């Protein structure tokens, strides 16, 4: 029978879904998507979704180390006749996906505003997997702070630095340039490819002192 078209993997918060088109056939066809991920013992592919009727497939249980490229292929069957496979390009979760923003918290302590950057949902978990032994973690957080009418970034090493921990990150700031409405937003940057997480929505605060 005909061949699937425009195969595409996509990921968010680490769980990719294979997508593919198909022309409308007389009888409703089924599909089978198979995943093969680099570092295969031999050369066998894996059936992710066997003879499915839809046009998508959540391959979460084929995403090993989120840095190890995988290729998925799909086919159809109808009449009883199957077709040739459709090949996705090499996908790499960590290089090719996107991760939700971190969760920011601003507040106050005498002469300093405190900022809490809770690591994106995915990472904070107490691993079961569904971040030991994977270079796919956040290395630097970019805390931006907008005040009066000026802006300053703030690197933060989640590793070589003891502000962060398995849960959050800290960043104190001096009550600067007299007047307030400090506005905080932050993005995460990943190891190896250096892909940014989503930049959180601005969570401001206002100060009045003398």
């Amino acid at each position: 029978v005909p061949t699937p078209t425009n195969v595409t993997i996509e990921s968010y918060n680490m769980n990719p879904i294979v997508y593919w088109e198909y022309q409308i056939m007389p009888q409703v066809p089924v599909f089978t998507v198979e995943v093969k991920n680099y570092g295969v013992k031999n050369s066998e592919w894996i059936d992710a979704c066997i003879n499915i009727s839809h046009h998508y497939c959540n391959i979460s249980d084929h995403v090993g180390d989120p840095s190890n490229s995988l290729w998925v292929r799909v086919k159809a069957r109808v009449g009883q006749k199957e077709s040739a496979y459709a090949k996705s390009e090499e996908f790499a979760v960590c290089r090719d996906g996107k991760i939700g923003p971190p969760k920011l918290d601003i507040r106050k302590e005498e002469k300093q505003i405190m900022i809490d950057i809770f690591h994106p949902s995915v990472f904070v978990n107490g691993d079961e997997q569904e971040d030991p032994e994977t270079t796919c973690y956040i290395r630097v957080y970019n805390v931006y702070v907008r005040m009066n009418g000026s802006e300053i970034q703030y690197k933060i090493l989640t590793q070589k630095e003891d502000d962060c921990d398995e849960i959050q990150c800290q960043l104190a700031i001096p009550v600067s340039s007299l007047n307030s409405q400090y506005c905080v937003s932050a993005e995460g940057v990943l190891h190896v490819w250096g892909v940014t997480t989503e930049k959180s929505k601005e969570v401001c605060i206002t100060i009045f002192n003398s």
Binding site: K36, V40, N42, E89, G194
Partner: protein, 127 residues
């Protein structure tokens, strides 16, 4: 911040068409072996053979003008990371990697320095 070399690594990756299904077949050369070792010394007794390998590889490809800029770029970064920017280290390493294991004199000279050599490759630690 993207590391300068990934660009060039992926670039090479296209050239060799390593980004394609099949490549996934048959275990992994480095990646896994390098994963069984976390003690730095050991990581080094293996990374050494891995760098000498990429070193032969890029060598047998210096004729290929099309990927030269990529291959030099990767190389400097490997120097900066593995040889810790230590010009000697690189140069000593190099020397050792190029010794005709068949030059009939090179094999004598080496058979000579064996005992002295073997009297020191046993992990030493006192200072």
């Amino acid at each position: 911040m993207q590391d300068p070399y990934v660009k060039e690594a992926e670039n090479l990756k296209k050239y060799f068409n390593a980004g394609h299904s099949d490549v996934a077949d048959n275990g992994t050369l480095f990646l896994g072996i390098l994963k069984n070792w976390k003690e730095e010394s050991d990581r080094k007794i293996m990374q050494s053979q891995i760098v000498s390998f990429y070193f032969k590889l890029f060598k047998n490809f210096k004729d290929d003008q099309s990927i030269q800029k990529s291959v030099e770029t990767i190389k400097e970064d490997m120097n900066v990371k593995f040889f810790n920017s230590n010009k000697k280290k690189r140069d000593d390493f190099e020397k050792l990697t190029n010794y005709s294991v068949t030059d009939l004199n090179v094999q004598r000279k080496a058979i000579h320095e064996l005992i002295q050599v073997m009297a020191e490759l046993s992990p030493a630690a006192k200072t």
